[PDB]
Tab-separated table of C-alpha atoms and ligand atoms in Angstrom:
chain	number	residue	atom	x	y	z
J	2	UNK	CA	10.539	0.429	5.483
J	3	UNK	CA	12.649	2.867	3.895
J	4	UNK	CA	11.489	1.383	0.295
J	5	UNK	CA	8.016	2.812	1.176
J	6	UNK	CA	9.136	6.399	2.613
J	7	UNK	CA	11.118	6.746	-0.660
J	8	UNK	CA	8.406	6.215	-2.864
J	9	UNK	CA	4.949	6.513	-0.767
J	10	UNK	CA	2.495	6.364	-3.862
J	11	UNK	CA	4.231	3.390	-5.207
J	12	UNK	CA	2.977	1.674	-2.335
J	13	UNK	CA	-0.154	3.474	-0.975
J	14	UNK	CA	-1.445	5.131	-4.329
J	15	UNK	CA	-1.815	9.132	-4.971
J	16	UNK	CA	-0.674	10.998	-2.209
J	17	UNK	CA	-2.179	14.421	-3.392
J	18	UNK	CA	-5.819	13.488	-4.507
J	19	UNK	CA	-7.126	11.676	-1.506
J	20	UNK	CA	-6.779	8.512	-2.901
J	21	UNK	CA	-3.728	7.259	-0.877
J	22	UNK	CA	-5.032	8.567	2.208
J	23	UNK	CA	-8.134	6.742	2.120
J	24	UNK	CA	-6.282	3.347	1.137
J	25	UNK	CA	-4.704	3.946	4.449
J	26	UNK	CA	-8.020	3.057	6.436
J	27	UNK	CA	-8.751	0.309	3.933
J	28	UNK	CA	-5.531	-1.587	4.624
J	29	UNK	CA	-6.100	-1.253	8.183
J	30	UNK	CA	-9.829	-2.551	7.646
J	31	UNK	CA	-8.765	-5.485	5.708
J	32	UNK	CA	-6.439	-6.965	8.734
J	33	UNK	CA	-9.663	-6.019	10.989
J	34	UNK	CA	-11.810	-7.921	9.097
J	35	UNK	CA	-9.746	-10.856	8.961
J	36	UNK	CA	-9.145	-10.732	12.838
J	37	UNK	CA	-12.923	-10.061	13.632
J	38	UNK	CA	-14.029	-13.319	11.336
J	39	UNK	CA	-11.569	-15.302	13.421
J	40	UNK	CA	-13.618	-14.507	16.710
J	41	UNK	CA	-17.139	-14.819	18.085
J	42	UNK	CA	-18.847	-11.573	17.803
J	43	UNK	CA	-17.277	-10.370	14.598
J	44	UNK	CA	-17.519	-6.861	14.643
J	45	UNK	CA	-15.218	-3.836	13.577
J	46	UNK	CA	-15.661	-0.038	14.402
J	47	UNK	CA	-14.190	2.491	12.157
J	48	UNK	CA	-13.901	5.949	14.051
J	49	UNK	CA	-13.065	9.053	12.313
J	50	UNK	CA	-11.768	11.627	15.008
J	51	UNK	CA	-11.769	15.082	15.362
J	52	UNK	CA	-8.256	15.506	14.791
J	53	UNK	CA	-8.283	13.713	11.549
J	54	UNK	CA	-7.042	10.277	13.031
J	55	UNK	CA	-8.771	7.321	12.225
J	56	UNK	CA	-9.066	3.935	14.783
J	57	UNK	CA	-9.922	0.715	13.569
J	58	UNK	CA	-11.047	-2.038	16.204
J	59	UNK	CA	-11.937	-5.339	16.208
J	60	UNK	CA	-13.293	-7.952	18.926
J	61	UNK	CA	-11.230	-10.862	17.638
J	62	UNK	CA	-8.723	-12.972	19.467
J	63	UNK	CA	-5.794	-10.174	19.316
J	64	UNK	CA	-2.699	-9.705	17.111
J	65	UNK	CA	-0.006	-12.360	18.436
J	66	UNK	CA	2.187	-10.604	21.263
J	67	UNK	CA	5.120	-13.343	21.366
J	68	UNK	CA	8.602	-12.555	20.548
J	69	UNK	CA	9.177	-13.713	17.177
J	70	UNK	CA	11.962	-16.490	17.229
J	71	UNK	CA	14.127	-14.906	14.446
J	72	UNK	CA	13.444	-11.432	14.291
J	73	UNK	CA	13.540	-10.988	18.222
J	74	UNK	CA	10.953	-8.551	18.817
J	75	UNK	CA	7.084	-9.222	19.361
J	76	UNK	CA	5.060	-10.855	16.281
J	77	UNK	CA	3.199	-7.508	16.740
J	78	UNK	CA	6.048	-5.292	15.810
J	79	UNK	CA	7.179	-7.618	13.293
J	80	UNK	CA	4.093	-7.219	11.263
J	81	UNK	CA	4.159	-3.316	11.821
J	82	UNK	CA	7.976	-2.883	10.667
J	83	UNK	CA	8.558	-5.740	8.139
J	84	UNK	CA	7.248	-5.350	4.432
J	85	UNK	CA	5.191	-8.377	3.365
J	103	UNK	CA	-2.921	-6.181	-0.059
J	104	UNK	CA	0.254	-4.284	0.857
J	105	UNK	CA	0.495	-4.690	4.606
J	106	UNK	CA	-0.348	-2.625	7.516
J	107	UNK	CA	3.521	-1.841	7.707
J	108	UNK	CA	2.837	0.172	4.628
J	109	UNK	CA	0.513	2.327	7.105
J	110	UNK	CA	2.666	2.875	9.674
J	111	UNK	CA	5.535	4.023	7.677
J	112	UNK	CA	3.275	6.621	6.325
J	113	UNK	CA	1.956	7.747	9.810
J	114	UNK	CA	3.471	10.604	11.932
J	115	UNK	CA	1.719	8.453	14.670
J	116	UNK	CA	0.480	5.049	15.124
J	117	UNK	CA	-1.247	3.565	18.412
J	118	UNK	CA	-1.784	0.036	19.003
J	119	UNK	CA	-3.645	-1.901	21.740
J	120	UNK	CA	-4.087	-5.843	21.875
J	121	UNK	CA	-6.009	-7.256	24.207
J	122	UNK	CA	-5.207	-11.133	24.753
J	123	UNK	CA	-4.740	-13.857	27.136
J	124	UNK	CA	-5.809	-11.542	30.098
J	125	UNK	CA	-3.512	-8.864	29.152
J	126	UNK	CA	-3.639	-5.270	27.627
J	127	UNK	CA	-0.590	-4.477	25.484
J	128	UNK	CA	0.330	-1.136	23.888
J	129	UNK	CA	2.947	0.104	21.546
J	130	UNK	CA	3.299	3.524	19.790
J	131	UNK	CA	5.111	4.202	16.571
J	132	UNK	CA	6.099	7.662	15.084
J	133	UNK	CA	6.837	7.140	11.088
J	134	UNK	CA	7.058	3.598	11.431
J	135	UNK	CA	9.523	3.722	14.237
J	136	UNK	CA	8.700	1.937	17.778
J	137	UNK	CA	8.986	4.522	20.353
J	138	UNK	CA	9.397	1.293	23.098
J	139	UNK	CA	8.609	-2.364	22.820
J	140	UNK	CA	5.268	-3.819	22.926
J	141	UNK	CA	4.382	-3.500	26.699
J	142	UNK	CA	1.691	-5.114	29.100
J	143	UNK	CA	-0.041	-2.153	30.796
J	144	UNK	CA	-2.971	-3.870	32.431
J	145	UNK	CA	-5.235	-6.797	32.802
J	146	UNK	CA	-8.312	-7.587	30.885
J	147	UNK	CA	-11.259	-10.094	30.225
J	148	UNK	CA	-11.749	-8.871	26.743
J	149	UNK	CA	-9.883	-9.789	23.610
J	150	UNK	CA	-9.252	-7.664	20.201
J	151	UNK	CA	-6.919	-5.573	18.633
J	152	UNK	CA	-7.398	-1.361	17.948
J	153	UNK	CA	-5.232	0.849	15.923
J	154	UNK	CA	-5.285	4.515	15.606
J	155	UNK	CA	-3.092	6.370	13.079
J	156	UNK	CA	-2.176	9.876	12.089
J	157	UNK	CA	-1.372	10.157	8.625
J	158	UNK	CA	1.669	11.647	7.728
J	159	UNK	CA	1.151	15.420	6.668
J	160	UNK	CA	4.624	15.034	5.303
J	161	UNK	CA	3.558	12.393	2.893
J	162	UNK	CA	-0.373	13.351	2.249
J	163	UNK	CA	-0.957	16.937	0.718
J	164	UNK	CA	-3.951	19.247	-0.696
J	165	UNK	CA	-6.776	16.394	0.378
J	166	UNK	CA	-5.669	15.643	4.369
J	167	UNK	CA	-9.204	15.335	5.940
J	168	UNK	CA	-11.071	12.131	5.855
J	169	UNK	CA	-14.250	12.403	3.269
J	170	UNK	CA	-16.812	9.973	5.332
J	171	UNK	CA	-18.522	9.077	2.152
J	172	UNK	CA	-15.539	7.588	0.271
J	173	UNK	CA	-15.204	5.387	3.758
J	174	UNK	CA	-18.848	4.527	3.916
J	175	UNK	CA	-19.194	3.231	0.198
J	176	UNK	CA	-16.132	0.842	0.551
J	177	UNK	CA	-17.125	-0.395	4.100
J	178	UNK	CA	-20.685	-1.226	2.433
J	179	UNK	CA	-19.004	-3.457	-0.024
J	180	UNK	CA	-17.267	-5.010	2.223
J	181	UNK	CA	-20.169	-5.917	4.435
J	182	UNK	CA	-21.695	-7.747	1.706
J	183	UNK	CA	-18.567	-9.539	1.067
J	184	UNK	CA	-17.928	-10.381	4.542
J	185	UNK	CA	-21.738	-11.632	5.435
J	186	UNK	CA	-21.888	-11.814	9.325
J	187	UNK	CA	-19.287	-9.134	10.205
J	188	UNK	CA	-20.656	-5.931	11.597
J	189	UNK	CA	-19.046	-2.839	10.320
J	190	UNK	CA	-19.950	0.408	12.172
J	191	UNK	CA	-18.673	3.590	11.192
J	192	UNK	CA	-18.422	6.877	13.394
J	193	UNK	CA	-17.425	10.624	12.644
J	194	UNK	CA	-16.910	12.217	15.673
J	195	UNK	CA	-16.327	15.460	13.595
J	196	UNK	CA	-20.345	15.771	13.107
J	197	UNK	CA	-21.604	12.733	14.935
J	198	UNK	CA	-22.489	10.973	11.675
J	199	UNK	CA	-22.665	7.148	11.930
J	200	UNK	CA	-23.598	3.879	9.883
J	201	UNK	CA	-23.685	0.319	10.666
J	202	UNK	CA	-23.369	-2.032	7.900
J	203	UNK	CA	-24.515	-5.614	8.385
J	204	UNK	CA	-25.700	-7.873	5.524
Y	301	LIG	O1	-8.646	-4.366	14.073
Y	301	LIG	C1	-7.621	-4.436	13.968
Y	301	LIG	C2	-7.056	-3.112	13.605
Y	301	LIG	C3	-5.871	-3.014	12.972
Y	301	LIG	C4	-4.830	-4.410	12.859
Y	301	LIG	S1	-3.641	-4.758	11.776
Y	301	LIG	C5	-2.207	-4.751	13.250
Y	301	LIG	C6	-2.025	-4.522	14.564
Y	301	LIG	C7	-1.694	-4.577	15.643
Y	301	LIG	C8	-0.227	-4.963	14.922
Y	301	LIG	O2	0.796	-4.979	16.091
Y	301	LIG	C9	-0.259	-5.397	13.854
Y	301	LIG	C10	-1.147	-5.430	12.868
Y	301	LIG	C11	-5.473	-5.533	13.060
Y	301	LIG	C12	-6.954	-5.355	13.669
Y	302	LIG	N1	9.291	14.038	11.077
Y	302	LIG	C1	9.634	13.158	10.368
Y	302	LIG	N2	9.339	12.534	9.380
Y	302	LIG	C2	10.243	11.145	9.441
Y	302	LIG	C3	10.343	10.240	8.422
Y	302	LIG	C4	11.130	9.296	8.912
Y	302	LIG	C5	11.494	9.150	10.291
Y	302	LIG	C6	11.487	9.910	11.160
Y	302	LIG	C7	10.733	11.198	10.768
Y	302	LIG	N3	10.253	12.267	11.346
Protein backbone atom coordinates (compact mmCIF):
# COMPACT_ATOMS: atom_id res chain seq x y z
CA UNK A 1 0.00 0.00 0.00
CA UNK A 2 2.98 2.44 0.05
CA UNK A 3 2.32 3.30 -3.65
CA UNK A 4 -1.10 4.62 -2.60
CA UNK A 5 0.19 6.53 0.42
CA UNK A 6 2.89 8.14 -1.80
CA UNK A 7 0.40 9.68 -4.25
CA UNK A 8 -3.12 9.48 -2.76
CA UNK A 9 -4.57 11.83 -5.40
CA UNK A 10 -3.63 9.44 -8.22
CA UNK A 11 -5.70 6.62 -6.68
CA UNK A 12 -8.65 8.37 -5.00
CA UNK A 13 -8.98 11.76 -6.75
CA UNK A 14 -8.45 15.30 -5.45
CA UNK A 15 -7.63 15.29 -1.71
CA UNK A 16 -8.32 19.04 -1.22
CA UNK A 17 -11.69 19.87 -2.91
CA UNK A 18 -13.82 17.00 -1.47
CA UNK A 19 -13.90 14.77 -4.57
CA UNK A 20 -11.40 12.21 -3.20
CA UNK A 21 -13.09 12.27 0.21
CA UNK A 22 -16.43 11.29 -1.31
CA UNK A 23 -14.89 8.76 -3.70
CA UNK A 24 -13.76 6.92 -0.51
CA UNK A 25 -17.42 6.20 0.31
CA UNK A 26 -18.26 5.27 -3.30
CA UNK A 27 -15.49 2.69 -3.44
CA UNK A 28 -16.79 1.01 -0.25
CA UNK A 29 -20.39 1.12 -1.58
CA UNK A 30 -19.40 -0.70 -4.84
CA UNK A 31 -18.08 -3.63 -2.76
CA UNK A 32 -21.15 -3.55 -0.51
CA UNK A 33 -23.49 -3.62 -3.57
CA UNK A 34 -21.63 -6.64 -4.97
CA UNK A 35 -22.07 -8.40 -1.62
CA UNK A 36 -25.73 -7.48 -1.24
CA UNK A 37 -26.49 -8.79 -4.77
CA UNK A 38 -25.26 -12.29 -3.80
CA UNK A 39 -27.68 -12.54 -0.80
CA UNK A 40 -31.46 -12.77 -0.28
CA UNK A 41 -32.65 -9.45 1.22
CA UNK A 42 -30.33 -7.21 -0.84
CA UNK A 43 -30.06 -4.12 1.38
CA UNK A 44 -27.13 -1.81 2.14
CA UNK A 45 -27.09 0.98 4.73
CA UNK A 46 -24.71 3.95 4.44
CA UNK A 47 -24.40 5.98 7.66
CA UNK A 48 -22.63 9.32 8.17
CA UNK A 49 -21.55 9.41 11.82
CA UNK A 50 -21.34 12.50 14.03
CA UNK A 51 -17.50 12.18 14.20
CA UNK A 52 -17.38 12.34 10.33
CA UNK A 53 -16.66 8.68 9.84
CA UNK A 54 -18.85 6.67 7.46
CA UNK A 55 -20.10 3.09 7.76
CA UNK A 56 -21.38 0.86 4.97
CA UNK A 57 -23.08 -2.46 5.71
CA UNK A 58 -24.74 -5.19 3.71
CA UNK A 59 -26.89 -8.23 4.56
CA UNK A 60 -25.15 -10.58 2.11
CA UNK A 61 -23.08 -13.71 2.71
CA UNK A 62 -20.04 -12.13 4.43
CA UNK A 63 -16.59 -11.44 2.97
CA UNK A 64 -14.57 -14.73 3.06
CA UNK A 65 -12.59 -15.29 6.27
CA UNK A 66 -10.38 -18.35 5.60
CA UNK A 67 -6.60 -18.05 5.45
CA UNK A 68 -5.41 -17.29 1.92
CA UNK A 69 -3.17 -20.26 0.82
CA UNK A 70 -0.40 -18.09 -0.69
CA UNK A 71 -0.62 -14.82 1.30
CA UNK A 72 -0.93 -16.62 4.66
CA UNK A 73 -3.44 -14.22 6.25
CA UNK A 74 -7.26 -14.07 6.14
CA UNK A 75 -8.78 -13.45 2.71
CA UNK A 76 -10.49 -10.47 4.37
CA UNK A 77 -7.06 -8.96 5.15
CA UNK A 78 -5.68 -9.73 1.65
CA UNK A 79 -8.46 -7.67 0.12
CA UNK A 80 -7.82 -4.84 2.60
CA UNK A 81 -4.03 -4.75 2.15
CA UNK A 82 -3.17 -5.76 -1.45
CA UNK A 83 -3.60 -3.44 -4.47
CA UNK A 84 -5.84 -5.12 -7.05
CA UNK A 85 -12.78 0.34 -9.44
CA UNK A 86 -9.57 1.07 -7.47
CA UNK A 87 -10.15 -1.44 -4.58
CA UNK A 88 -11.15 -0.96 -0.94
CA UNK A 89 -7.43 -1.37 -0.06
CA UNK A 90 -7.08 2.26 -1.28
CA UNK A 91 -9.75 3.41 1.18
CA UNK A 92 -8.00 1.48 3.93
CA UNK A 93 -4.57 3.01 3.14
CA UNK A 94 -6.07 6.51 3.32
CA UNK A 95 -8.09 5.96 6.52
CA UNK A 96 -6.58 6.91 9.87
CA UNK A 97 -8.82 4.15 11.21
CA UNK A 98 -10.94 1.41 9.59
CA UNK A 99 -13.01 -1.14 11.51
CA UNK A 100 -14.66 -4.16 9.93
CA UNK A 101 -17.12 -6.82 11.05
CA UNK A 102 -17.95 -9.97 9.06
CA UNK A 103 -20.83 -12.22 10.07
CA UNK A 104 -20.38 -15.59 8.38
CA UNK A 105 -20.71 -19.35 9.10
CA UNK A 106 -22.21 -18.75 12.56
CA UNK A 107 -19.41 -16.40 13.70
CA UNK A 108 -18.69 -12.66 14.17
CA UNK A 109 -15.21 -11.71 12.93
CA UNK A 110 -13.61 -8.31 13.72
CA UNK A 111 -10.51 -6.41 12.69
CA UNK A 112 -9.13 -2.89 13.06
CA UNK A 113 -6.69 -1.07 10.80
CA UNK A 114 -4.88 2.24 11.23
CA UNK A 115 -3.53 3.87 8.03
CA UNK A 116 -3.96 0.48 6.35
CA UNK A 117 -1.95 -1.41 8.98
CA UNK A 118 -3.80 -4.29 10.67
CA UNK A 119 -3.75 -3.98 14.44
CA UNK A 120 -4.22 -7.72 14.95
CA UNK A 121 -5.30 -10.65 12.77
CA UNK A 122 -8.98 -11.11 11.83
CA UNK A 123 -10.50 -12.64 14.97
CA UNK A 124 -13.66 -14.48 15.94
CA UNK A 125 -15.38 -12.48 18.71
CA UNK A 126 -18.79 -14.21 19.06
CA UNK A 127 -21.60 -16.22 17.45
CA UNK A 128 -24.47 -15.11 15.26
CA UNK A 129 -27.37 -16.25 13.07
CA UNK A 130 -26.90 -13.25 10.75
CA UNK A 131 -24.70 -12.86 7.68
CA UNK A 132 -23.14 -9.78 6.12
CA UNK A 133 -20.30 -7.30 6.24
CA UNK A 134 -19.78 -3.83 7.71
CA UNK A 135 -16.92 -1.34 7.35
CA UNK A 136 -16.61 1.92 9.25
CA UNK A 137 -13.79 4.26 8.21
CA UNK A 138 -12.31 7.53 9.47
CA UNK A 139 -10.63 9.33 6.52
CA UNK A 140 -7.07 10.37 7.23
CA UNK A 141 -6.89 14.11 8.04
CA UNK A 142 -3.22 13.91 7.09
CA UNK A 143 -4.40 13.22 3.53
CA UNK A 144 -7.78 14.97 3.26
CA UNK A 145 -7.55 18.77 3.63
CA UNK A 146 -9.92 21.74 3.31
CA UNK A 147 -13.07 19.65 2.63
CA UNK A 148 -12.95 17.15 5.52
CA UNK A 149 -16.67 16.75 6.30
CA UNK A 150 -19.11 14.65 4.32
CA UNK A 151 -21.76 16.48 2.27
CA UNK A 152 -25.04 14.50 2.45
CA UNK A 153 -26.27 15.54 -1.01
CA UNK A 154 -23.11 14.37 -2.79
CA UNK A 155 -23.63 10.91 -1.26
CA UNK A 156 -27.40 10.96 -1.90
CA UNK A 157 -26.98 11.89 -5.58
CA UNK A 158 -24.66 8.96 -6.35
CA UNK A 159 -26.64 6.43 -4.30
CA UNK A 160 -29.78 7.44 -6.23
CA UNK A 161 -28.02 6.70 -9.57
CA UNK A 162 -26.80 3.38 -8.19
CA UNK A 163 -30.32 2.34 -7.08
CA UNK A 164 -31.63 2.64 -10.68
CA UNK A 165 -28.67 0.69 -12.06
CA UNK A 166 -28.82 -2.01 -9.35
CA UNK A 167 -32.60 -2.49 -9.44
CA UNK A 168 -33.92 -4.48 -6.49
CA UNK A 169 -31.08 -3.45 -4.13
CA UNK A 170 -32.38 -1.37 -1.23
CA UNK A 171 -30.04 1.55 -0.34
CA UNK A 172 -30.54 3.44 2.93
CA UNK A 173 -28.65 6.64 3.69
CA UNK A 174 -28.63 8.06 7.26
CA UNK A 175 -26.99 11.21 8.61
CA UNK A 176 -26.56 11.02 12.38
CA UNK A 177 -25.35 14.67 12.52
CA UNK A 178 -28.84 16.08 11.79
CA UNK A 179 -31.18 13.03 11.46
CA UNK A 180 -31.64 13.27 7.66
CA UNK A 181 -32.49 10.01 5.89
CA UNK A 182 -33.31 8.60 2.47
CA UNK A 183 -34.28 5.23 1.07
CA UNK A 184 -33.39 4.55 -2.57
CA UNK A 185 -35.09 1.46 -4.02
CA UNK A 186 -36.18 1.18 -7.70
O1 LIG B 1 -20.93 -3.96 3.21
C1 LIG B 1 -19.63 -3.96 2.82
C2 LIG B 1 -18.78 -2.91 3.17
C3 LIG B 1 -17.47 -2.92 2.76
C4 LIG B 1 -16.98 -3.97 2.00
S1 LIG B 1 -15.36 -4.14 1.30
C5 LIG B 1 -14.56 -5.32 2.35
C6 LIG B 1 -14.99 -5.56 3.66
C7 LIG B 1 -14.21 -6.32 4.51
C8 LIG B 1 -13.01 -6.85 4.07
O2 LIG B 1 -12.22 -7.63 4.84
C9 LIG B 1 -12.58 -6.61 2.77
C10 LIG B 1 -13.35 -5.84 1.93
C11 LIG B 1 -17.82 -5.03 1.67
C12 LIG B 1 -19.14 -5.02 2.08
N1 LIG C 1 -0.13 9.10 11.76
C1 LIG C 1 0.16 8.17 10.87
N2 LIG C 1 0.16 8.35 9.54
C2 LIG C 1 0.60 7.13 9.02
C3 LIG C 1 0.81 6.74 7.70
C4 LIG C 1 1.26 5.45 7.45
C5 LIG C 1 1.49 4.56 8.49
C6 LIG C 1 1.28 4.94 9.81
C7 LIG C 1 0.84 6.23 10.06
N3 LIG C 1 0.56 6.91 11.22
